[PDB]
Design a protein around this nucleic acid. Structure first.
Ligand SMILES: [Mg+2]
Ligand SMILES: [Mg+2]
Ligand SMILES: [Mg+2]
Ligand SMILES: [Mg+2]
Ligand SMILES: [Mg+2]
Ligand SMILES: [Mg+2]
Ligand SMILES: [Zn+2]
Ligand SMILES: [Zn+2]
Lengths: 97, 96, 87, 150, 120, 217, 129, 81, 25, 206
RNA sequence: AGGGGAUCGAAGAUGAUCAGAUACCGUCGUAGUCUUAACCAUAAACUAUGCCGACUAGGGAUCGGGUGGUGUUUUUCUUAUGACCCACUCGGCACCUUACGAGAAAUCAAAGUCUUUGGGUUCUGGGGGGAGUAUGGUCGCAAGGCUGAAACUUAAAGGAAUU
């Protein structure tokens, strides 16, 4: 039967949506059976920051972060990303803390 | 209300629907098409005489094991070569 | 009910709920008898004599039961003002 | 629940409980009638006339004030259109759609809508034929429809 | 790994329930008492029970514990209670609201009022 | 050995409740087994079937024994106990106990006109458990129990003489069928006849009368 | 389309009774519905009921006694022939005994007992047991 | 729930509920009797418009039609009914 | 066996049959 | 049927107001609640004080019906009322279940804590809900202190009240106790607040 | 049948990997992928839930409109508007709790109001295989589609849960 009410979700009053391609697999995937993670990483590493501060010019510098919405297609997201897998009672949860 | 017009002047649609539906029931289909007369070796009869062409021990289906002491029989009326099993403790000593 | 020439049969004559008139069943492991005391001036709560209700399981289960009880009270004069006809 | 979409609207004009005139709202009946006839003369179509009456003048519904309807009144004075108002509007719409289609060869949605319009027209035509407002065996469609409009 | 077992703990609890007096804090006396009152087919077990009882006694000096309050421990809580004379008059006379005032208007006779506002 | 837990048990032991009709009137819980035995000495108890029931392990399996037990008389009280224990006789005993706890009344009624004593049901009434719908239907005098074996036995236990049944769904799972039948029987005392428009008194319960003799000293 | 109106009336009533509402509002409400309700009343199944003269179609407010169990209207109005009546009652009613099959006849919307007494029957509308 | 003595509810409930879904349906739309800064005359004007509404003869324009209730022309006094 | 694959094989068979028929003609 | 002196006396009303029984209740709602005399701008509904008091009286009149004193059982799990419950029990007959309820206690006639009530009084149908549910099994009316935000499931008579916490719950308990004492008990007169203090109750040392 | 032919890419090459790989991975690469004329009518074309209609249980949200606010806020004085805000309210797309009903169950405010069986209507199914085959019609430029058997053949094939 239906493993989920929503299924791979979000296609509700939406006919047949547009396909986003994967990051890892580069498999095409619907923007709902999607699994999108926003990776706001520092443009540098934490051990690389100190060195930069030591050597670099300008008053401390603001330092930029990069912004990537990475679409881990369903399967690849079970090479430990979001996803994880859950219990039947654990799947009725729409929160990440 | 589900399917069938619970209508009142509805009846022809109901009757036709029933007719159409019936064919999916096997027995009725067999009766109507006349499968009995065109096929199934016997002429839709209970019993038929035939002629012992050749005695064949048919090797039985699974779990069970044995040889099943049947007869390839050519029927007289249609001329069809069936295999009729013979009951009990040999009795091919009777059949020949 | 009655066997022709009088003679009552059918035992265990069902309690009916006071709110819904729906029969209180035999294994109504949900229903209740509510007992409310007839009351008098200075101390006085008059033992032995109560105004009594039965509430059938089903209404209670539904949730709307308190209001029904209030209604019953307002009718038998055990309350005034509490519950109105129009909501 | 809507003749052509999956939509199930219930936006609708309501009506008051009183069939009697709304007391204080003055004027008369004759005046109202005169106004209606003037509007008819000016080329407005029933619904429009009613609208005009309601807002600017002291009118609720002509039925309440005069006694008879708008359309009935028009018929009495002999000023009513030959093809019923709604039907006429439908025909006009159809014509417009046809024109659009003539220009745009690939516009499938428009074609589909045109089909629906045509169907609606047919329904309306049938009912007019039944109540005898369009003279029988008169069909309203594509070639003659344009001619009919104006 | 010296976690006292279920059984010992249960026994200790029972002892505390039935004989909360005659459990004089220190081990030695308590052990002897345990040996006397409770019938243990062992010695080590008895000792363990005694130890646990002593621990419980120590705990019960520094408050009440769950599953350990039996009549004589109850009356040292129930009576050792009741503050009282501050009431719910204090901080001016009857602080109310607009809605509250309105409510009062319909029901009660004559009551003192200090009306606030309440807004977004 | 007797020894009562619960107020009702104590009351029964004192002998201030005469018959289970009164209990039924106030829909009283009968968690204690002995009460029914005390009040109904007429209990004819029948075993239906004891299907073995399995549970799988790393080695072998667990063969428990689900035994369906009916309980009854001829008066119109019926029990139904289902139990699943390892020991079969023990399981049966447990089932019996359960059935006794359960025991329920029946509005035995008239086929058509009163004449003499009710040995049918009031109303075409049904249950449904799992997916087995037992309907029962008030048969006329002498027309017997018209039922599948299990249901027939249940009816006999009840003290119904005449009943048509329309048992539908997979009645071959006996337990479910039995449950459905029991449910249907229970339902009898729910269908408001016009013989029931009449307003009742609402008695204060045995719990609220013989209050002092109840509860432990 | 609200094809049949009696059906609608009964359905809502039934629902109300099932929940334990003491009152129902019926939307369209005809002569026929009113007659049916009157019949029900006559044998005490329904309490008071109030037809609002909407300056439109109708509206019925009902008072429920809790004496209702199921009120059904049968789907086509089968023309019914005095012996057919017996069959219908056997099928539709919980006893050879009580409750009523509410058939419309030439003499008016009666129950079934009344019809039998009067010796006239016609089409069936509902029933009340 | 359970009992709601139906026919007579409070005016507030009626006001809240959709003006079609009530008991006896009445429109909850008024007739603004409007006065202009020009002449000393009042016009009976429906609360909704669908038309740009001029006066008895004057080209004053009383109300501009929005989706619902008509937004009156800047500074014009109006009664009710 | 996959249903799709089965269907494909059936189609192929049909095509072959058609070809044979054509040849015969 | 009516004492007529049993109108809400001004002092009592004042007490209630101080407790903010009526002038709590979060802006959310349960649909089965007409104990609400208007609503406040931002976050508050207001509970018809008089109605609440009358229902409390009714509740008392129900606790007055049961002849056995320690047969009526009070129950609170949430801390904002345990003490109050205990006080109530002390004052009346009443067995209390403060804290962890023991799920299946009115059923399970084998438990070390077997109470069989004929009436049960509850603080929170939001927390103690288990107890209420259990009551369904064995047929007990449930008198409860409803916040007008909580369910009415399995509740026969529910005093409308505030359950934010603090002085409201305790006050209500105290009032109920007082009323019960008035109706068959030691304290005989209509007037006088007596030694029965509202602050014997409430939430003390945290 | 023309154009346009970037990218990717059925076929093909072609490198590995493998006992083997005209499979998975790598690198090229026509057809195609765009598009204008036409056709073909199928998809897990799925919400695997026919469309209408009525009713029964709450709840916040969210989009679309619409009234009710001496509500906030923008200030260019009073402002008049917009954007919020609160209370509604129709219409929708869904969702969360309860089941007092269902259902075999999973679950469902509909899959409810069905043995207490009857609002109106279409269409489809009758154990599994054989078989969506064969034949015949047809509609296709073909690939194919719509319709669609039986002979045989077997006691299971299924579902939904549990250990
Ligand atoms: Mg949509
Ligand atoms: Mg290779
Ligand atoms: Mg290749
Ligand atoms: Mg298809
Ligand atoms: Mg499909
Ligand atoms: Mg088949
Ligand atoms: Zn991927
Ligand atoms: Zn003017």
């Amino acid at each position: 039967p239906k493993k989920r009410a929503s299924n791979g979700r979000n296609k509700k009053g939406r006919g047949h949506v547009k396909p986003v391609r994967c990051v890892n697999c580069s498999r095409s995937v619907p923007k709902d059976k999607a699994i999108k993670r926003m990776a706001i990483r520092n443009i540098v590493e934490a051990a690389a920051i100190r060195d930069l501060s030591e050597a670099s010019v300008y008053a401390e510098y603001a330092l930029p972060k990069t912004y990537n919405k990475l679409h881990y297609c369903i399967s690849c997201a079970i090479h430990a990303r979001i996803v994880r897998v859950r219990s039947r009672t654990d799947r009725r949860i729409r929160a990440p803390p | 209300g589900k399917g069938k017009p619970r209508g009142l002047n509805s009846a022809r649609k109901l009757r036709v629907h029933r007719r159409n539906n019936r064919w999916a029931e096997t027995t009725y289909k067999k009766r109507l098409l006349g499968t009995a007369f065109k096929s199934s070796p016997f002429g839709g009869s209970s019993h038929a005489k035939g002629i012992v062409l050749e005695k064949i021990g048919i090797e039985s289906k699974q779990p069970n094991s044995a040889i099943r002491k049947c007869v390839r029989v050519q029927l007289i009326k249609n001329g069809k070569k069936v295999t009729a099993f013979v009951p009990n403790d040999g009795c091919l000593n009777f059949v020949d | 009910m009655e066997n022709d020439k009088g003679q009552l049969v059918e035992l265990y004559v069902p309690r009916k709920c006071s709110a819904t008139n729906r029969i209180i069943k035999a294994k109504d492991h949900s229903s209740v008898q509510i007992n409310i005391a007839q009351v008098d001036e200075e101390g006085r709560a008059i033992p032995g004599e109560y105004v009594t209700y039965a509430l059938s399981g089903y209404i209670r289960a539904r949730g709307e039961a308190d209001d029904s009880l209030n209604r019953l009270a307002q009718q038998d004069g055990l309350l005034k003002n509490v519950w109105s006809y129009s909501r | 629940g809507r003749m052509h979409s999956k939509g199930k609207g219930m936006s609708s004009s309501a009506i008051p409980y009183s069939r009697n005139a709304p007391a204080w709202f003055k004027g008369s009946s004759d005046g109202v009638v005169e106004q209606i006839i003037k509007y008819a003369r000016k080329g407005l179509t029933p619904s429009q006339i009613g609208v005009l009456l309601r807002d600017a003048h002291g009118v609720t519904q002509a039925k309440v004030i005069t006694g008879n309807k708008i359309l009935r009144i028009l018929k009495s004075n002999g000023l009513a259109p030959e093809i019923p108002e709604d039907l006429y509007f439908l025909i006009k719409k159809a014509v417009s759609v046809r024109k659009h289609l003539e220009r745009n060869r690939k516009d499938k949605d428009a074609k589909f809508r045109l089909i629906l319009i045509e169907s609606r027209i047919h329904r309306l035509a049938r009912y007019y034929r039944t109540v005898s407002v369009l003279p029988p065996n008169w069909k309203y469609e594509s070639a003659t429809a344009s001619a009919l409009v104006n | 790994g010296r976690v006292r077992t279920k059984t010992v703990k249960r026994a200790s609890k029972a002892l505390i329930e039935k004989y909360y007096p005659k459990l004089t804090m220190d081990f030695q006396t308590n052990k002897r008492l345990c040996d006397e009152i409770a019938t243990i087919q062992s010695k080590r077990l008895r000792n363990k029970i005694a130890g646990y009882t002593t621990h419980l006694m120590k705990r019960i000096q520094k408050g009440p514990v769950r599953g350990i309050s039996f009549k004589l421990q109850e009356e040292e809580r129930e009576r050792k209670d009741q503050y009282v004379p501050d009431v719910s008059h204090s901080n001016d006379v009857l602080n109310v609201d607009t809605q509250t005032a309105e409510l009062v208007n319909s029901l009660g006779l004559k009551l003192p009022l200090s009306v606030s506002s309440v807004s977004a | 050995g007797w020894v009562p837990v619960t107020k009702l048990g104590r009351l029964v032991k004192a002998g201030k409740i005469s018959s289970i009709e009164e209990i039924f009137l106030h829909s009283l819980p009968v968690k204690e087994f002995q009460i029914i035995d005390q009040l109904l000495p007429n209990l004819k108890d029948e075993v239906m079937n004891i299907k073995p029931v399995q549970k799988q392990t790393r080695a072998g399996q667990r063969t428990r024994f689900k035994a369906v037990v009916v309980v009854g008389d001829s008066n119109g009280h019926v029990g139904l106990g289902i139990k699943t224990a390892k020991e079969v006789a023990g399981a049966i005993r447990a089932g019996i106990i359960i059935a006794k706890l359960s025991v329920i009344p029946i509005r035995r009624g008239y086929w058509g006109t009163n004449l003499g004593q009710p040995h049918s049901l009031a109303t075409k009434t049904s249950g449904k458990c799992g997916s087995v719908s037992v309907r029962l239907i008030p048969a006329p005098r002498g027309s017997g129990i018209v039922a599948s074996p299990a249901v027939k036995k249940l009816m006999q236990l009840a003290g119904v003489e005449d009943v048509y049944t329309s048992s539908t769904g997979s009645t071959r799972t006996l337990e479910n069928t039995l449950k459905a039948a029991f449910v249907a029987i229970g339902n009898t005392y729910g269908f408001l006849t016009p013989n029931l428009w009449e307003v009742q008194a609402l008695t204060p319960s045995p719990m609220d009368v013989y209050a002092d003799y109840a509860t432990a000293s | 389309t609200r094809t049949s109106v009696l059906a609608d009336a009964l359905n809502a009533i039934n629902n109300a009774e099932k929940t334990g509402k003491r009152q129902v509002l019926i939307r369209p409400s005809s002569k026929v519905i009113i007659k049916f309700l009157q019949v029900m009343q006559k044998h005490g199944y329904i309490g008071e009921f109030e037809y609002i003269d909407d300056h439109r179609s109708g509206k019925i407010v009902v008072q429920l006694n809790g004496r209702l169990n199921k009120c059904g209207v049968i789907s086509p109005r089968f023309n019914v022939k005095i012996a057919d009546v017996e069959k219908w009652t056997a099928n539709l009613l919980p006893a050879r005994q009580f409750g009523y099959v509410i058939l419309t006849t030439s003499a008016g919307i009666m129950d079934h007992e009344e019809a039998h007494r009067k010796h006239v029957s016609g089409k069936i509308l509902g029933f009340v047991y | 729930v359970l009992v709601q003595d139906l026919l007579h509810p409070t005016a507030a409930s009626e006001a809240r509920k959709h003006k079609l879904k009530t008991l006896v349906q009445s429109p909850r739309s008024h007739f603004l009797d409007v006065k202009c800064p020009g002449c000393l005359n009042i016009t009976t004007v429906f609360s909704h418009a669908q038309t740009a509404v001029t006066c008895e003869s004057c080209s004053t324009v009383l109300c501009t039609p929005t989706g619902g209730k008509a937004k009156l022309s800047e500074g014009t006094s109006f009664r009710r009914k | 066996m996959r249903a799709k694959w089965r269907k494909k094989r059936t189609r192929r068979l049909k095509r072959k049959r058609r070809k044979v028929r054509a040849r015969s003609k | 049927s009516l004492p007529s002196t049993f109108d809400l006396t001004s002092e009592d009303a004042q007490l209630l107001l101080a407790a903010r029984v009526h002038l709590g209740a979060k802006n959310v709602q349960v649909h089965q609640e007409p104990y609400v005399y208007k609503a406040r701008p931002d976050g508050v509904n207001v509970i018809n004080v008089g109605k609440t008091w009358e229902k409390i009286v009714l509740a008392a009149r129900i606790i007055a019906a049961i002849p056995n004193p320690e047969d009526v059982v009070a129950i609170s799990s949430r801390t904002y009322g345990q003490r109050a419950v205990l006080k109530y029990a002390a004052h009346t007959g009443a067995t209390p279940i403060a804290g962890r309820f023991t799920p299946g206690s009115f059923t399970n006639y084998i438990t070390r804590s077997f109470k069989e009530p004929r009436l049960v009084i509850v603080t929170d149908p939001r927390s103690d809900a288990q107890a209420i549910k259990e009551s369904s099994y064995v047929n007990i009316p449930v008198i409860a202190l409803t916040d007008l935000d909580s369910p009415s499931e399995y509740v026969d008579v529910a005093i409308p009240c505030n359950n934010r916490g603090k002085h409201s719950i305790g006050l209500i308990w105290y009032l109920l106790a007082r009323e019960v004492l008035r109706l068959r008990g030691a304290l005989p007169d209509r007037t006088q607040p007596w030694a029965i203090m509202p602050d014997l109750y409430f939430y003390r040392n945290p």
